């Protein structure tokens, strides 16, 4: 049985003109083959995983870690979305602060 430990990470986007940046990369999504996930516990997990964190970027200072699984973003579930949907949820230009619920640990 799986019990995920979730914690929060608040990222403050960087606005370089018309260029909004979070400073991290995401992989996964229900439309992608999960057997290829390089972090996942269960190779059938189609969740959204953080694959990279940019040095000196907002995500780094916020505490996001490579390998973290994104469960939610500003209230929106991220457990069963397509890669594109995941991206759209994390790229709302009108939002400056993106609040995340992530898991980098299981219980036991």
């Amino acid at each position: 049985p799986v019990t995920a430990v979730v914690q929060r990470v608040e990222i403050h986007k960087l606005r370089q003109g018309e260029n909004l940046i979070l400073g991290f990369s995401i992989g996964g999504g229900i439309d992608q083959d999960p057997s290829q996930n390089p972090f996942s516990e269960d190779k059938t997990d189609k969740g959204i995983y953080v694959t990279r964190v940019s040095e000196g970027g907002p995500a780094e200072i916020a505490g996001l870690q490579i390998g973290d699984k994104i469960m939610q973003v500003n209230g929106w579930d991220m457990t069963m979305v397509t890669h594109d949907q995941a991206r759209k949820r994390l790229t709302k230009r009108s939002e400056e602060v993106v609040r995340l619920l992530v898991t980098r640990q299981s219980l036991q």
């Binding site: 979070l22 400073g23 995401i26 992989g27 057997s35 990279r52 890669h83 991206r87």
Partner: peptide, 9 residues
């Protein structure tokens, strides 16, 4: 068919 891949944000 579609492989696992990542995108930068």
């Amino acid at each position: 068919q579609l492989a696992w891949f990542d995108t930068d944000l």
